Amino acid sequence: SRKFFVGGNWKMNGRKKNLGELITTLNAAKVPADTEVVCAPPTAYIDFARQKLDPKIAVAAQNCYKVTNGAFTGEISPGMIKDCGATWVVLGHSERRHVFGESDELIGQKVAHALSEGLGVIACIGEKLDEREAGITEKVVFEQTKVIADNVKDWSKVVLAYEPVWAIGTGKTATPQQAQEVHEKLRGWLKSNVSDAVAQSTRIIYGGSVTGATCKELASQPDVDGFLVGGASLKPEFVDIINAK
Amino acid sequence: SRKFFVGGNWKMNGRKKNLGELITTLNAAKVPADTEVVCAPPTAYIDFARQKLDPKIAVAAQNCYKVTNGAFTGEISPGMIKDCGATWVVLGHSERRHVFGESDELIGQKVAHALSEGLGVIACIGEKLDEREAGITEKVVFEQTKVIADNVKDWSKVVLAYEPVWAIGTGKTATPQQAQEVHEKLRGWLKSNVSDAVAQSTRIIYGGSVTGATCKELASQPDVDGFLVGGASLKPEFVDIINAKQ
Numbered sequence A: 001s002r003k004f005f006v007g008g009n010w011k012m013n014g015r016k017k018n019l020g021e022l023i024t025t026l027n028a029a030k031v032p033a034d035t036e037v038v039c040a041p042p043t044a045y046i047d048f049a050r051q052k053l054d055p056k057i058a059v060a061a062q063n064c065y066k067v068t069n070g071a072f073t074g075e076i077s078p079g080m081i082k083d084c085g086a087t088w089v090v091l092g093h094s095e096r097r098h099v100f101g102e103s104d105e106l107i108g109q110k111v112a113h114a115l116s117e118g119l120g121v122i123a124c125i126g127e128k129l130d131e132r133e134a135g136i137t138e139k140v141v142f143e144q145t146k147v148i149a150d151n152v153k154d155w156s157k158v159v160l161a162y163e164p165v166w167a168i169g170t171g172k173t174a175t176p177q178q179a180q181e182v183h184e185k186l187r188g189w190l191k192s193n194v195s196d197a198v199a200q201s202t203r204i205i206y207g208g209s210v211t212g213a214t215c216k217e218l219a220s221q222p223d224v225d226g227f228l229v230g231g232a233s234l235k236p237e238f239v240d241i242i243n244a245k
Numbered sequence B: 001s002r003k004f005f006v007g008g009n010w011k012m013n014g015r016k017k018n019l020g021e022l023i024t025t026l027n028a029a030k031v032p033a034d035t036e037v038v039c040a041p042p043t044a045y046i047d048f049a050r051q052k053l054d055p056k057i058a059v060a061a062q063n064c065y066k067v068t069n070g071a072f073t074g075e076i077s078p079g080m081i082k083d084c085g086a087t088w089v090v091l092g093h094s095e096r097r098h099v100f101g102e103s104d105e106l107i108g109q110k111v112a113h114a115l116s117e118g119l120g121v122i123a124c125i126g127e128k129l130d131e132r133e134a135g136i137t138e139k140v141v142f143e144q145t146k147v148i149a150d151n152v153k154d155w156s157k158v159v160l161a162y163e164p165v166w167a168i169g170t171g172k173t174a175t176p177q178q179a180q181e182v183h184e185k186l187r188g189w190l191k192s193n194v195s196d197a198v199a200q201s202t203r204i205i206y207g208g209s210v211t212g213a214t215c216k217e218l219a220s221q222p223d224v225d226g227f228l229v230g231g232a233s234l235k236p237e238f239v240d241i242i243n244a245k246q
Helices: A016-027 A043-052 A078-083 A092-098 A104-116 A128-132 A138-152 A176-193 A194-200 A215-219 A237-242 B014-026 B045-050 B078-083 B094-098 B104-117 B129-133 B137-148 B176-193 B196-201 B216-221 B239-244
Strands: A003-011 A037-041 A059-062 A088-091 A118-124 A158-162 A204-207 A226-229 B004-009 B035-040 B058-061 B088-091 B121-127 B158-162 B204-206 B226-229
Touching: A003 A088, A003 A158, A003 A204, A003 A237, A016 A237, A016 B104, A037 A088, A037 B088, A037 B176, A043 A059, A043 B078, A059 A118, A059 A158, A059 B014, A059 B104, A088 A104, A104 A118, A104 B094, A118 A138, A138 A158, A138 A176, A158 A176, A158 B004, A176 A194, A176 B058, A176 B104, A215 A226, A215 A237, A237 B216, A237 B226, B004 B094, B004 B204, B004 B239, B014 B035, B014 B239, B045 B058, B045 B204, B058 B216, B088 B104, B094 B204, B121 B137, B158 B176, B176 B204, B176 B216, B216 B226, B226 B239
Parallel strands: A003 A037, A003 A226, A037 A059, A059 A088, A088 A118, A118 A158, A158 A204, A204 A226, B004 B035, B004 B226, B035 B058, B058 B088, B088 B121, B121 B158, B158 B204, B204 B226
Antiparallel strands: none
16 A cells, blocks of 8 residues: 655745744654655755654655766755655755746756665656646646656656646635546556556555645545645644544 | 855755765854855755754855746746845856856846845856856946846845856866956955945855865955855865855
8 A cells, every 4th residue: 555645835934933843743643554644845954854853753855966976056965865864855946946947857867866875756747737727737747757757767656746837825725536547547657658556556646736625535536545735834734634434 | 254154055965965075065064253154055945954054154156147037938937036035146157157048138127126125146257268258257247237236226235256167167267366366356345336335244255166176265355255165165274165265
């Protein structure tokens, strides 16, 4: 069975005071035995958050670059993320792709490097509103997934995150059936293009205005293996989402 | 009376162990009179480095974004940098412009936001080799400086860093005359387009393969007020650079 996975993406929010308070609340929460919980603090607070968080919660970086060290002012490497005690990185997030112009090619190189260095990868994919309305969701997500898959060095350390761009931060949550429909196809894509084992074992998580009010019906879909949560990860309802099953 | 300014840009280098060792070396440096030393660790280590560094060395972030909080996965704000005890940010670095595609317009918005929030800015400008060889160095650097200047909310908190792209990481250090020629022009640009006071008070530092072997002759040029140092900031030679006017 795939272990239920809940990530909280704090994005560019927080200071030591308010994040420290949130962390205290999370450390007091009961993480089910069948759930893996990950928090992704702003980059300046990776180390702080790992120090403050109970080990039952993992830490993720929000991004990384594609070499171990080098002349890349403003970047961090998987080796740094590991050195700070974090065990995952979020790659290909919508904001990186669409605000900061990260290409699929660049995301694939980051995936290859992070996995080669033994860091877990939450690899994000998803279509824009205009693509959804044109009926080409599948084409877009399959193309993104192929680039990720072609660079996966260790499938045991990947989580795929389907996050339709029109659902991020907009309050426009995907319906359960909408999410299940895409997750099912993605899983079929993995079966046909990689292996049965990889299709069976890879967590495909949904993100997009996931909230306490929407999480249970989404989590009950058989191909929805958890969530990546943005706005609600900073809120007490993040605990309800952790317990969505 | 401009204070000599030496910044060290660690770029994407270091782990807690080797940066702890580098920090020990920096903490043992006697900072001369009237000299300001700033170090810019990788973003994951801003807090670590500020905790470990003696207050005689300031910490900078290597980059930031242009709002206080928001939905910008992978970014950090001036408020976070201040919260970690850092007092500067490097903006418009060549690597950000030319590897990561940051436009002048974006850099100007970052400069405005950081300064509005009381964070010091090391604002980088510089021409590429093909621009220099085309004879357009001045046009390029003046255009970059104008975008910075148009967004400066507090000149007391800005340092301008002239870093010709062909000199960064290449070993191809500008000659003293090459640097002084551009710095003199930039200073003239400030005089003509801002004020005499701003021209007189603004540090214009040089970067581009600054090393212990080149730093004194560069620092002696009258419009070269210090350095932004990449590769040599990771070595004990950085201390020789701090003492370039000694």
